[PDB]
Amino acid sequence: XXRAX
Amino acid sequence: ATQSKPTPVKPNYALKFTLAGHTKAVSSVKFSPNGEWLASSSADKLIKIWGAYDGKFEKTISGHKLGISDVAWSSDSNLLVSASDDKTLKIWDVSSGKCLKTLKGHSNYVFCCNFNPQSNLIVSGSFDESVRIWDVKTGKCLKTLPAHSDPVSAVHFNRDGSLIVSSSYDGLCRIWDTASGQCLKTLINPPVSFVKFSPNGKYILAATLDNTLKLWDYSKGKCLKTYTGHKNEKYCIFANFSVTGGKWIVSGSEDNLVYIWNLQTKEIVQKLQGHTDVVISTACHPTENIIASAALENDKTIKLWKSDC
Incomplete structure (x- = not known):
């Protein structure tokens, strides 16, 4: 991963 | 012109180790409270543990079905x-x-x-x-x-x-x-x-x-x-309070730099160059002047930086 794009 | 050298301390973080092993974007790095370890998580569905001082790879922890x-x-x-x-x-x-x-x-x-x-x-x-x-x-x-x-x-x-x-x-x-x-x-x-x-x-x-x-x-x-x-x-992007030496605010950035501000003055006192993608996560060691930074897919590495102050 959600945070990693 | 006598001239002295300004008195307010500034950090001198320098790159010490680059930690390679994740196969996708790194998402988060955190130091153990005891100062011994750094944990990293990744879109690759893994957690990796590394030596906090020397960046030595210790182990991989797996089990999640999707990225972390x-x-x-x-x-x-x-x-x-x-x-x-x-x-x-x-x-x-x-x-x-x-x-x-x-x-x-x-x-x-x-x-x-x-x-x-x-x-x-x-x-x-x-x-x-x-x-x-x-x-x-x-x-x-x-x-x-x-x-x-x-x-x-x-x-x-x-x-x-x-x-x-x-x-x-x-x-x-x-x-x-x-x-x-x-x-x-x-x-x-x-x-x-x-x-x-x-x-x-x-x-x-x-x-x-x-x-x-x-x-x-x-x-x-x-x-x-x-x-x-x-x-x-x-x-x-994670941000942190650095408190082991001078009082800084530390954050990653979408221009691939680690930024360090003086907490009181709000001035940028250092920019750490090295990463080749967005610095998504930074962490500050609990007892020593050590920062860990991690980056996205084009980079996939963690970097350990150390400062005299």
Whole structure:
């Protein structure tokens, strides 16, 4: 991963 | 011209080690409270443990079914908790790599997680717009808070565990009473991409997706300091208080640099160059002047930097 794009 | 050398200390962080091994974007790095280890999480569905001082690879912890957005250590450095796109959190025994519990309840990606100081509870934030409070011993969900109206970007307990701060893409920061799950305050609007309590108990540091970090007095609801000069318009980038030497604010940036500001003056005192993608995560060592930084897909490495001050 959600945070990693 | 006598001339001396200015007196106010500035950091001199220099690159010491580059930690390679993740096969996809790194998401989060955190130092163990005992100073011995660094944990990293990745879109590759793995957690890796590394020596905090020498960057030596120690082990991989696997088990999640999809990528991991965050990890956090227990106070005694024995446990980790991870937040995954698989809609679960997992609690891990670091020494054995064993999954002790799987925490099920969220209905969308789990994005952020943290233990309380006592480490009997975990807090999680999700794309499902809720914050959940979990019992560590049983793995059971104690409370679900209807915290936000968009994905929750960060969750953090204060230094005695009595409060939780949450942030969201909805543009809000909220403070919650742990014991009751009641909302004590709403701070309010660009998306709030990161938040945490200050080590001195009084403030929260919040990042917004308009290239701004702000230090808030949460009681009074007032913004005491603003930190700018970096690029943060897209990603949920972690920020930190560095307190082992000089008093700094540390953050990654979408221009591939680590930024370091003087907390009081708000001046940029260093930019650390090296990464070849967005620096999504930074962490500050609990006792030594050491920063860990991690980057996205084009880079996939963690870097350890050390300073005399």
